[PDB]
XYZ file of C-alpha atoms in Angstrom:
750
model
C 4.914 27.828 31.544
C 6.002 25.590 34.413
C 5.365 22.349 32.755
C 3.592 19.198 33.950
C 6.671 17.816 35.755
C 6.991 20.863 38.159
C 3.317 21.274 38.871
C 2.648 17.562 39.526
C 5.707 17.581 41.953
C 4.490 20.523 43.764
C 1.098 18.529 44.129
C 2.558 15.335 45.202
C 3.797 16.251 48.519
C 1.499 18.640 50.115
C 0.247 18.319 53.741
C -3.669 18.219 53.397
C -4.991 21.374 55.282
C -5.380 22.819 58.648
C -9.266 22.399 59.228
C -10.858 23.606 62.251
C -14.283 21.709 63.130
C -13.482 18.120 61.957
C -16.939 16.956 61.855
C -17.055 13.179 62.460
C -20.291 10.955 61.567
C -20.298 7.169 62.231
C -22.950 4.930 60.777
C -24.521 2.933 63.460
C -27.052 0.183 63.583
C -29.371 -0.434 60.741
C -26.992 -0.212 57.833
C -25.081 -3.381 58.654
C -27.691 -5.973 58.041
C -29.449 -5.700 54.649
C -27.021 -6.674 52.015
C -28.850 -5.611 49.068
C -30.845 -2.623 50.063
C -29.717 0.243 47.597
C -29.640 3.141 50.001
C -29.085 6.620 49.240
C -25.874 8.175 50.615
C -26.548 11.937 50.407
C -30.015 12.017 51.833
C -29.987 9.356 53.980
C -26.353 9.824 55.735
C -24.468 12.868 54.626
C -27.059 15.479 54.341
C -26.666 16.021 58.116
C -23.399 17.894 57.632
C -23.369 18.962 54.067
C -25.435 21.983 53.394
C -26.248 23.466 49.919
C -27.036 27.055 48.879
C -26.685 29.553 46.126
C -23.639 31.486 45.232
C -23.809 35.150 44.062
C -21.514 35.167 41.018
C -21.306 32.262 38.967
C -24.736 31.335 40.124
C -25.950 27.609 39.488
C -25.850 25.926 42.910
C -23.242 25.622 45.922
C -22.328 22.957 48.477
C -19.987 22.930 51.421
C -19.586 21.059 54.554
C -20.730 23.031 57.634
C -20.119 26.837 58.189
C -17.745 27.573 55.391
C -15.372 25.650 52.951
C -12.693 24.818 55.603
C -14.291 22.117 57.680
C -13.360 18.710 57.231
C -16.163 16.115 57.189
C -15.227 12.339 57.801
C -17.386 9.425 57.789
C -16.576 6.149 59.185
C -18.688 3.122 58.419
C -16.286 0.181 58.068
C -19.002 -2.409 58.383
C -22.187 -0.906 56.511
C -23.347 -3.436 53.920
C -25.286 -2.492 50.896
C -25.018 -0.535 47.830
C -24.987 3.443 48.144
C -25.308 6.162 45.722
C -24.382 9.786 45.399
C -26.668 10.867 42.296
C -26.595 14.654 42.059
C -24.126 16.379 44.532
C -23.076 18.927 41.718
C -20.814 21.949 42.517
C -19.351 20.456 45.798
C -17.089 22.996 46.764
C -16.722 21.504 50.367
C -13.152 20.574 51.601
C -11.773 17.236 52.871
C -14.444 14.712 52.717
C -13.415 11.008 53.828
C -16.104 8.274 53.302
C -14.697 4.937 54.623
C -16.958 1.976 53.269
C -15.335 -1.201 53.529
C -17.532 -4.153 52.240
C -19.963 -1.578 50.639
C -20.668 -0.977 47.058
C -20.635 2.811 45.811
C -22.390 4.173 42.853
C -21.539 7.703 41.631
C -24.427 8.232 39.459
C -27.983 7.544 39.214
C -30.051 10.133 36.925
C -27.574 12.849 37.657
C -23.773 13.306 37.824
C -21.475 14.510 40.172
C -18.939 17.401 40.753
C -16.118 18.265 43.057
C -14.791 21.766 43.113
C -12.709 24.207 44.975
C -12.426 28.056 45.534
C -9.479 30.107 45.209
C -9.424 31.758 48.709
C -6.234 33.633 49.718
C -5.210 30.293 51.542
C -5.150 28.107 48.297
C -6.723 25.075 49.509
C -7.475 21.845 47.962
C -10.536 19.670 48.723
C -9.037 16.061 48.976
C -12.249 14.097 48.306
C -11.785 10.586 49.369
C -13.894 7.195 49.095
C -12.978 3.828 50.238
C -15.602 1.556 48.740
C -15.342 -2.113 47.614
C -16.720 -1.667 43.940
C -17.361 1.867 42.706
C -19.279 1.666 39.681
C -19.253 5.330 38.349
C -22.207 4.899 35.933
C -22.779 8.665 35.275
C -20.612 11.514 34.546
C -18.289 13.080 37.223
C -16.457 16.499 36.743
C -13.379 17.197 38.999
C -12.545 20.831 39.470
C -15.267 22.072 37.200
C -16.466 25.908 36.819
C -19.182 26.265 39.261
C -21.527 28.516 37.257
C -20.240 31.021 34.760
C -16.899 32.596 35.405
C -17.525 35.494 37.761
C -17.571 35.575 41.463
C -14.969 33.238 42.918
C -12.466 31.140 40.804
C -11.552 27.485 41.157
C -8.366 26.197 42.657
C -6.959 22.697 42.626
C -8.501 19.614 43.934
C -7.745 15.794 44.447
C -10.032 13.017 44.105
C -9.262 9.487 45.445
C -11.145 6.383 44.686
C -10.028 3.317 46.524
C -11.864 0.306 45.897
C -10.709 -3.328 46.586
C -12.449 -5.017 43.724
C -12.812 -2.739 40.567
C -13.646 0.669 39.508
C -15.714 -0.053 36.222
C -17.584 2.678 34.604
C -20.677 3.106 32.158
C -20.995 3.705 28.536
C -21.920 7.336 28.962
C -20.101 8.068 32.177
C -17.814 11.004 30.918
C -15.015 11.687 33.728
C -13.851 15.015 32.829
C -10.956 16.486 35.103
C -9.793 20.135 34.499
C -6.990 22.602 35.142
C -6.140 21.869 38.628
C -7.861 18.246 39.067
C -6.092 14.688 39.726
C -7.618 11.509 40.173
C -5.851 8.872 42.305
C -7.167 4.988 41.609
C -6.058 2.316 43.954
C -8.223 -0.585 43.375
C -7.467 -3.530 41.144
C -8.540 -3.977 37.464
C -9.702 -0.167 36.712
C -11.864 -0.545 33.568
C -13.153 2.913 32.627
C -15.423 2.208 29.631
C -16.218 5.865 29.316
C -14.982 9.275 27.805
C -11.815 10.167 30.071
C -11.460 13.652 29.272
C -8.192 15.023 30.709
C -7.979 18.762 30.290
C -10.914 20.824 29.258
C -11.987 24.387 28.839
C -12.681 25.541 32.404
C -13.956 29.006 31.397
C -15.848 30.015 28.396
C -13.056 31.763 26.637
C -9.900 30.941 28.291
C -8.010 29.630 25.324
C -4.616 30.417 26.753
C -4.966 28.516 29.918
C -2.172 26.107 30.879
C -4.882 23.283 32.017
C -2.771 20.573 33.520
C -4.190 17.171 35.139
C -3.289 13.759 36.424
C -4.680 10.302 36.626
C -2.350 8.555 39.086
C -3.243 5.154 38.595
C -0.139 3.845 40.474
C -1.571 1.541 43.010
C -3.732 -0.638 40.467
C -2.348 -3.943 41.017
C -4.673 -5.668 38.332
C -5.507 -4.442 34.564
C -5.493 -0.705 34.015
C -8.058 -0.433 30.839
C -9.117 3.033 29.555
C -11.572 2.750 26.444
C -11.665 6.448 25.150
C -9.253 8.963 26.336
C -9.493 12.437 25.161
C -6.741 15.000 26.116
C -7.114 18.697 25.517
C -9.943 20.908 24.333
C -9.163 24.069 22.275
C -5.941 25.082 24.467
C -2.390 23.610 25.064
C -3.216 21.041 27.804
C -0.594 18.949 29.180
C -2.069 15.987 30.728
C 0.015 13.206 32.559
C -0.580 9.678 33.660
C 1.362 8.018 36.327
C 0.459 4.490 35.359
C 1.341 1.117 36.725
C 3.312 -0.784 34.117
C 0.619 -2.012 32.043
C -1.802 0.318 30.315
C -3.880 -0.892 27.645
C -6.037 2.030 26.328
C -8.261 2.471 23.297
C -8.956 5.553 21.466
C -6.735 8.563 22.096
C -7.781 11.812 20.891
C -5.143 14.589 21.266
C -5.666 18.247 20.247
C -3.484 20.255 18.049
C -1.264 21.247 20.929
C -1.862 18.709 23.468
C 0.683 16.693 25.319
C 0.494 13.432 27.395
C 3.038 11.864 29.867
C 2.481 7.953 30.465
C 4.870 7.407 33.113
C 5.614 3.851 33.985
C 7.050 3.021 37.349
C 10.827 2.503 37.767
C 12.510 -1.021 37.738
C 11.967 -1.911 41.261
C 8.813 -0.186 41.653
C 7.934 2.609 43.597
C 9.571 2.905 47.046
C 10.898 36.839 64.232
C 11.937 33.396 63.592
C 13.089 31.303 60.568
C 10.821 28.421 59.408
C 11.935 25.303 57.605
C 9.707 24.405 54.769
C 9.517 20.614 54.256
C 11.661 18.732 51.644
C 10.106 18.962 48.264
C 11.342 15.800 46.367
C 11.069 16.413 42.710
C 11.847 13.936 39.946
C 13.243 14.339 36.517
C 12.280 11.984 33.515
C 13.612 8.694 34.733
C 13.614 5.279 33.068
C 10.788 2.960 33.099
C 11.254 -0.901 34.138
C 11.658 -3.696 31.853
C 8.208 -5.065 31.777
C 6.329 -1.688 31.297
C 4.128 -1.698 28.296
C 1.795 0.857 26.855
C -0.769 -0.609 24.406
C -2.272 2.295 22.860
C -4.475 0.982 19.797
C -5.627 4.286 17.874
C -4.109 7.839 18.038
C -6.426 10.368 16.425
C -5.951 14.152 16.430
C -8.753 16.712 16.490
C -7.715 19.830 14.596
C -9.652 23.005 13.906
C -9.434 26.661 14.685
C -6.760 29.385 13.720
C -3.585 29.668 11.390
C -0.159 29.996 13.021
C 3.095 30.702 11.540
C 4.059 27.065 12.716
C 2.418 23.849 13.542
C 1.178 23.006 17.021
C 2.860 19.650 17.412
C 0.610 17.400 19.409
C 2.913 14.985 21.425
C 2.666 11.789 23.868
C 5.739 11.297 25.840
C 6.268 7.697 27.437
C 8.804 6.159 29.674
C 7.757 2.543 29.063
C 10.214 -0.040 27.698
C 7.624 -0.756 25.102
C 5.271 1.632 23.395
C 3.092 -0.724 21.037
C 0.561 0.901 18.948
C -2.231 -1.458 17.736
C -4.183 -1.843 14.617
C -5.735 1.505 14.503
C -2.536 3.208 13.678
C -2.061 6.808 13.662
C -4.642 9.555 12.484
C -3.743 13.214 11.938
C -6.234 15.865 10.973
C -4.710 18.768 9.042
C -5.607 22.360 8.874
C -4.153 24.981 6.567
C -0.940 24.921 8.602
C 0.952 21.864 9.120
C -0.035 19.856 12.020
C 2.582 17.625 13.647
C 2.632 14.502 15.888
C 5.367 13.656 18.144
C 5.256 10.119 19.454
C 8.212 10.068 21.693
C 9.691 7.479 24.052
C 12.427 8.438 26.243
C 13.805 5.018 27.372
C 12.218 2.488 25.339
C 11.112 1.062 21.993
C 8.267 1.773 19.494
C 6.335 -0.797 17.684
C 3.815 0.529 15.278
C 1.584 -2.008 13.553
C -1.054 0.397 11.852
C -1.495 2.631 8.896
C -0.318 6.079 9.073
C -3.333 7.931 7.804
C -4.076 11.675 7.373
C -7.585 12.899 7.544
C -8.568 9.131 8.116
C -7.362 7.976 4.858
C -4.201 5.972 3.920
C -3.016 8.635 1.210
C -3.566 11.755 2.883
C -2.974 14.527 0.364
C -1.970 17.783 2.032
C -1.228 21.224 0.254
C 2.292 23.149 0.326
C 1.550 25.200 3.590
C -0.166 22.121 5.335
C 2.966 20.068 5.947
C 1.537 17.136 8.050
C 4.827 15.950 9.697
C 4.832 12.533 11.652
C 7.547 12.222 14.099
C 9.082 9.262 16.207
C 11.740 9.220 18.873
C 12.545 5.811 19.943
C 14.889 5.706 22.995
C 15.909 9.239 23.200
C 17.937 9.270 26.669
C 19.459 5.586 26.329
C 20.180 5.832 22.536
C 19.425 2.156 21.957
C 15.795 2.085 21.186
C 14.436 0.579 17.978
C 11.462 1.949 16.009
C 10.073 -1.339 14.400
C 7.121 -0.758 11.935
C 5.379 -3.775 11.013
C 2.956 -2.160 8.446
C 3.431 -1.145 4.811
C 3.230 2.715 5.326
C 2.006 5.067 2.761
C 2.728 8.697 2.372
C 0.870 11.058 0.410
C 1.774 14.636 -0.649
C 3.566 17.367 1.602
C 3.650 14.555 4.512
C 7.077 14.223 6.168
C 7.865 11.080 8.159
C 10.979 11.436 10.565
C 12.240 8.757 12.707
C 14.998 9.610 15.354
C 15.890 6.080 16.805
C 18.598 3.442 17.146
C 17.603 0.973 14.512
C 14.510 1.733 12.453
C 13.187 -1.349 11.115
C 10.486 -1.123 8.372
C 8.449 -3.225 5.913
C 7.418 -0.909 2.895
C 7.372 2.886 2.443
C 5.135 4.187 -0.695
C 5.918 7.659 -1.579
C 5.427 7.607 -5.251
C 1.705 8.721 -4.890
C 2.055 12.488 -4.113
C 5.594 13.837 -3.761
C 7.261 16.430 -1.562
C 8.009 13.978 1.073
C 10.807 14.471 3.657
C 11.717 11.104 4.792
C 14.006 12.101 7.283
C 16.204 9.519 9.080
C 19.238 11.747 10.398
C 18.595 10.836 14.020
C 18.989 7.137 13.171
C 22.183 5.826 14.863
C 23.093 3.006 12.565
C 20.485 0.769 10.474
C 17.293 1.516 8.624
C 16.311 -1.938 7.571
C 13.749 -1.133 4.980
C 12.215 -3.886 3.012
C 10.791 -2.203 0.033
C 10.899 1.743 -1.109
C 8.772 3.582 -3.676
C 9.879 7.128 -4.341
C 8.567 10.084 -6.523
C 10.166 13.329 -5.036
C 11.850 12.231 -1.822
C 14.539 13.923 0.447
C 15.731 10.743 1.997
C 18.665 11.374 4.375
C 20.140 8.235 5.638
C 23.749 7.674 6.819
C 23.526 3.742 6.942
C 21.043 1.583 5.448
C 19.809 -1.767 4.067
C 17.065 -1.556 1.259
C 16.738 -4.893 -0.210
C 14.205 -3.652 -2.847
C 14.135 -0.364 -4.369
C 11.256 0.956 -6.940
C 12.065 4.489 -8.230
C 9.192 5.856 -10.077
C 9.032 9.323 -11.906
C 6.785 12.094 -11.494
C 4.877 12.263 -14.848
C 5.753 15.417 -16.987
C 7.193 17.721 -14.205
C 10.801 18.270 -13.704
C 13.047 19.338 -10.801
C 11.467 16.805 -8.602
C 13.490 13.338 -7.720
C 14.709 11.063 -5.399
C 17.505 12.666 -3.454
C 19.705 10.861 -0.802
C 20.722 14.208 0.456
C 23.528 13.422 3.026
C 26.662 11.094 3.344
C 25.661 7.498 2.561
C 28.949 6.042 4.063
C 30.362 2.758 3.520
C 28.231 0.099 4.991
C 25.106 0.729 2.794
C 23.539 -1.863 0.809
C 20.645 -2.312 -1.915
C 19.821 -5.917 -2.752
C 17.551 -4.744 -5.661
C 17.089 -1.521 -7.894
C 14.192 -1.411 -10.221
C 13.729 1.873 -12.095
C 10.487 1.976 -14.114
C 10.011 3.716 -17.461
C 9.762 7.322 -17.498
C 8.021 9.632 -19.915
C 8.750 10.742 -23.518
C 11.941 12.580 -24.451
C 12.498 14.086 -21.027
C 14.202 12.909 -17.645
C 11.414 13.886 -15.328
C 11.949 11.515 -12.324
C 15.475 10.548 -11.195
C 17.855 9.377 -8.482
C 20.864 11.274 -7.314
C 23.035 11.053 -4.383
C 25.425 13.454 -2.672
C 28.160 11.700 -0.742
C 29.583 8.327 0.342
C 32.232 6.106 -0.868
C 30.622 2.569 -1.528
C 27.314 0.940 -1.739
C 26.723 -2.750 -2.673
C 24.073 -2.995 -5.447
C 23.114 -6.541 -5.935
C 20.938 -6.197 -9.010
C 19.842 -3.221 -11.122
C 17.370 -2.610 -14.011
C 17.594 0.416 -16.461
C 14.553 2.415 -17.651
C 13.966 4.813 -20.434
C 14.132 8.494 -19.173
C 14.903 7.969 -15.569
C 18.489 9.093 -14.372
C 20.491 7.062 -11.814
C 23.054 9.920 -10.870
C 25.740 8.534 -8.671
C 27.662 11.590 -7.571
C 30.571 11.413 -5.330
C 30.568 7.808 -4.561
C 33.771 5.793 -5.332
C 32.856 2.001 -5.377
C 29.307 1.746 -6.826
C 29.297 -2.017 -7.052
C 27.284 -4.437 -8.818
C 27.131 -8.241 -8.051
C 24.589 -9.818 -10.310
C 22.408 -9.190 -13.362
C 22.634 -5.817 -14.491
C 19.607 -5.525 -17.215
C 16.955 -3.094 -18.533
C 13.109 -2.875 -17.649
C 12.323 -3.474 -21.533
C 14.891 -6.427 -22.587
C 13.082 -6.902 -25.777
C 12.885 -3.331 -26.794
C 15.022 -0.735 -25.231
C 14.555 2.688 -26.258
C 15.418 6.302 -25.108
C 18.467 6.896 -22.790
C 19.196 6.373 -19.075
C 21.822 8.766 -17.564
C 23.930 6.312 -15.396
C 25.936 9.514 -14.545
C 28.549 7.925 -12.316
C 32.028 8.872 -10.922
C 33.225 5.304 -10.458
C 32.207 1.727 -10.374
C 33.351 -1.742 -9.814
C 31.761 -5.217 -10.958
C 32.250 -8.448 -9.134
C 31.672 -12.164 -9.818
C 29.438 -13.308 -12.640
C 27.258 -10.031 -12.786
C 25.921 -10.085 -16.292
C 25.299 -6.740 -17.907
C 22.857 -5.682 -20.915
C 25.202 -3.124 -22.358
C 23.275 -1.287 -25.268
C 23.260 1.944 -27.335
C 20.237 3.107 -25.250
C 21.918 3.909 -21.856
C 24.757 6.370 -21.741
C 26.780 4.682 -18.986
C 29.107 7.293 -18.141
C 32.097 6.395 -15.971
C 34.739 8.771 -14.655
C 36.597 6.176 -12.596
C 38.321 3.033 -12.100
C 36.033 0.500 -13.669
C 37.299 -2.918 -12.258
C 35.607 -5.987 -13.561
C 36.380 -9.233 -11.753
C 35.458 -12.616 -12.749
C 32.100 -11.334 -14.612
C 30.800 -11.647 -18.097
C 29.397 -8.427 -19.653
C 26.918 -9.107 -22.469
C 26.523 -6.942 -25.258
C 23.902 -6.419 -28.010
C 24.205 -4.639 -31.415
C 20.569 -3.357 -32.379
C 21.553 -3.040 -36.086
C 25.289 -3.966 -36.554
C 26.660 -1.137 -34.453
C 28.648 -2.085 -31.131
C 28.142 0.259 -28.341
C 31.382 1.593 -26.936
C 31.943 1.882 -23.277
C 33.239 5.596 -22.467
C 35.865 5.007 -19.756
C 36.557 8.460 -18.296
C 39.878 7.608 -16.464
C 40.949 3.771 -16.188
C 39.210 0.348 -16.804
C 41.579 -2.427 -15.093
C 40.398 -5.997 -15.395
C 41.610 -8.915 -13.347
C 40.096 -12.551 -13.859
C 41.084 -16.367 -13.225
C 40.844 -19.514 -15.062
C 36.870 -19.218 -15.129
C 36.458 -22.524 -16.849
C 33.136 -24.317 -16.997
C 31.640 -27.569 -18.186
C 29.167 -25.963 -20.608
C 31.887 -25.471 -23.331
C 34.820 -26.770 -21.802
C 36.344 -23.569 -22.668
C 36.562 -20.711 -20.077
C 33.185 -18.835 -19.320
C 32.861 -16.084 -21.957
C 34.351 -13.226 -20.237
C 32.677 -10.782 -22.857
C 29.800 -11.866 -24.642
C 28.609 -9.987 -28.062
C 25.324 -11.460 -28.924
C 22.751 -11.174 -32.005
C 25.760 -10.378 -34.203
C 24.110 -11.711 -37.336
C 23.403 -8.280 -38.873
C 27.106 -7.287 -37.662
C 28.739 -5.522 -40.435
C 31.740 -7.127 -41.855
C 34.890 -5.499 -42.810
C 34.049 -2.466 -40.498
C 35.793 -1.349 -37.366
C 33.504 -1.936 -34.252
C 34.181 0.159 -31.290
C 33.879 -2.024 -28.225
C 34.981 0.212 -25.529
C 36.838 3.447 -25.213
C 39.679 3.414 -22.708
C 42.739 5.161 -21.239
C 44.694 2.321 -19.317
C 43.389 -1.239 -19.816
C 45.509 -2.862 -17.184
C 44.421 -6.585 -17.921
C 45.516 -9.219 -15.549
C 44.686 -12.459 -13.505
C 44.944 -13.688 -10.023
C 48.312 -15.310 -11.247
C 50.756 -14.239 -13.886
C 50.334 -17.005 -16.577
C 47.188 -18.639 -17.508
C 46.506 -22.519 -17.015
C 48.831 -22.707 -13.740
C 51.747 -20.382 -14.094
C 53.729 -19.098 -16.839
C 55.311 -15.908 -18.541
C 52.762 -15.142 -21.270
C 51.607 -11.782 -21.975
C 48.305 -10.867 -20.642
C 46.606 -9.244 -23.542
C 46.733 -12.328 -26.011
C 44.205 -14.407 -23.745
C 42.062 -11.349 -23.627
C 41.191 -12.275 -27.170
C 40.592 -15.941 -26.159
C 38.004 -15.456 -23.553
C 36.170 -12.881 -25.686
C 33.073 -14.408 -27.376
C 30.954 -13.397 -30.496
C 27.800 -15.090 -29.756
C 25.271 -16.252 -32.341
C 22.649 -19.005 -32.937
C 23.132 -20.483 -29.461
C 26.967 -20.911 -30.207
C 29.968 -18.808 -30.884
C 31.168 -17.318 -34.204
C 34.309 -16.342 -32.390
C 35.650 -19.780 -31.688
C 34.418 -23.271 -31.543
C 35.927 -25.231 -28.558
C 35.351 -29.048 -29.179
C 34.988 -31.750 -27.079
C 32.875 -34.342 -29.058
C 31.101 -34.728 -32.512
C 27.719 -33.517 -31.614
C 28.755 -29.950 -31.112
C 30.163 -29.942 -34.817
C 26.758 -29.645 -36.342
C 25.871 -26.537 -34.416
C 29.526 -25.495 -35.026
C 28.821 -25.534 -38.611
C 25.622 -23.974 -38.148
C 27.270 -21.003 -36.441
C 30.063 -20.502 -39.027
C 27.732 -21.154 -41.899
C 29.611 -24.161 -43.649
C 28.185 -27.461 -44.490
C 31.766 -29.098 -44.000
C 30.799 -29.204 -40.560
C 26.953 -29.972 -40.570
C 26.705 -33.265 -42.604
C 30.053 -34.936 -41.690
C 31.226 -35.065 -38.075
C 34.503 -36.944 -38.999
C 35.252 -34.330 -41.589
C 37.740 -32.749 -39.044
C 39.704 -34.834 -36.612
C 41.948 -32.309 -35.060
C 39.215 -31.670 -32.348
C 39.590 -34.501 -29.962
C 40.081 -32.425 -26.801
C 41.212 -29.546 -29.044
C 39.763 -25.978 -30.225
C 40.110 -23.431 -33.238
C 39.647 -19.822 -33.412
C 37.696 -18.419 -36.422
C 40.309 -16.462 -38.534
C 38.984 -13.136 -40.075
C 37.819 -11.814 -36.726
C 40.203 -9.386 -35.327
C 40.138 -7.890 -31.613
C 42.673 -5.255 -30.226
C 43.840 -5.612 -26.603
C 46.371 -2.832 -26.356
C 46.045 -0.229 -23.385
C 44.299 2.560 -24.846
C 41.477 1.020 -27.172
C 39.774 -2.240 -27.676
C 37.752 -2.701 -30.794
C 36.358 -5.759 -33.022
C 37.346 -6.300 -36.654
C 34.899 -8.453 -37.964
C 36.144 -9.125 -41.392
C 35.694 -12.906 -42.221
C 34.026 -16.024 -41.158
C 36.640 -18.310 -42.481
C 36.515 -22.142 -42.739
C 39.323 -23.623 -40.657
C 41.996 -26.152 -42.020
C 42.665 -29.104 -40.364
C 46.343 -29.233 -39.313
C 47.753 -26.122 -40.659
C 47.149 -23.567 -37.794
C 44.916 -21.503 -35.508
C 44.299 -24.540 -33.297
C 44.429 -24.592 -29.632
C 43.785 -27.202 -26.847
C 41.468 -27.525 -23.783
C 41.993 -25.349 -20.952
C 41.215 -28.248 -18.276
C 41.093 -26.615 -15.165
C 38.184 -28.325 -13.467
């Protein structure tokens, strides 16, 4: 109920105790001349002033110092050379050891482990066990503040164990350090490398599943290389461990519980440092900011999860203060029971750099049912609000899993949610940018206020309906997608789809149609295209594609593929800039373009060297089966405001705008134009006669000499350019005369 930050702050500043009978033992002659002897330490030295016994209640064994557990023992070697071992000091209640062994190697295990416990008297004492060796070499298990026997009798209060080598504190493979509800562990060597199962937080009593169970491993003094190997927080309770680290903390496999915490606290930037009765000042610290060169290199975060079912999840979490919370190649695992387990990888004043696959139940997909919402969560830079959450791995979300990221700039590489569905991909906490590289969605609840997704795959959901991609908040202005690529849906029904909710503009560069997947573009006023606007099946479109817009704009050079098989619905001001929309007929019919409100158009002298004419502003291709003597609805309209960037074409003039609309349109056939035939030499005359179907231009190039730098329009092809309708009247493929009319010059604006 207090939390770890208060409990550690009230154990960090305590006067040790008030012991009567401070026993003192000094190792004299004999010890300091055999540098390899492998002594024992209890039986050869310490057994003089440490007497065992049997406790009635929780009855296994019992150890204290001498005449009760309130007597300090201090041992002063300072020159004893050798290698000492404890090997079996179990259930030491005791109180205030002190073993000063410079130039001596310790060993806290040989065929048996150790324990350091206290009792809960009315005085609330700690045990402050110290060692001051040169190497320590744990080499078997060590419990700190364990249970003595079984529950009854006297309970266990807090303790402190301090290990203070000057060359290194290694450990075995099977040396399980396991500290409980009240225990701490101060380390002060250089290059701690605990190669065993460090177990912070454990069931102290046999059934107390509602214990707070704090702990601490204060490795602040370690001037070398802190290196855990297998850390394991929590066991069948809500443990809140904490590590006060030393700005470089490589660990290995981390195993949280369902409802377990972790507080890896890096140091700050400059490093550390009757009658009334005035209690001493209790300095207490809130969550500060770690220094610049503070790293926490975790390389695997599993989560053990079994037990009951609660109305919420349990939200395992780890909270860091470091400036870089790297996570290595093992990534993130998350076991999931019936209710939805949750992981909170927080970082208060830093960054997050995950380089691993977000697994669930140790597979990359990780299916989960409806009640089991496995919720990943990240918080990069909460208190400073300028922390990025870089992911350098292609993530993959299965079914009913919910990634959320609350950072300043959430970079990515690729998201795969097309597999399972029901994926709340929240980004509402993100300050500005979400620079995703590739996105795959089936039924997603994307909530981004500003993004840059330079590739978008939208997949359908088979045959089910009501499930779709949903950008369910305000997209704003600065958004951008450099490629959209819908894929083909199912037969005769719009199963999957895209819809928006708000925003004003989003620069799409490239787009693809698809049969039976709908690109709803609600409430956004400047849906812009800038290059190729095609379909997924350019050789055989079929079905429909509900491009249910409200407005769009089309920029330079953006070729479209407008067909009868995609009901491109506009309710807004379609602005076409210097960009060439292409048509196809699919059986002699011309697909009209149903403008709801207005289609203004504005261009330039878009001349190229491919024809010598302007670039074809509207292309009508495959018009061989185009039915002669029939009205072809090219586009529905309400206001066609045609224009250019100047008033008159070819420089400046006062020619009306709608007449050169008939010039720059095209009717493209047989790799040429049947609309006009703009001529600069004699070689194009052959293909010109092949296009218009006359041998008077095929066999004889000098049949017509009105075409040296000139052009001619095919009469019998009529086009309307008034302000409410634009249509095509293909009524004649006539042979032009030489010097009678229907002749124009070159534009010549290169």
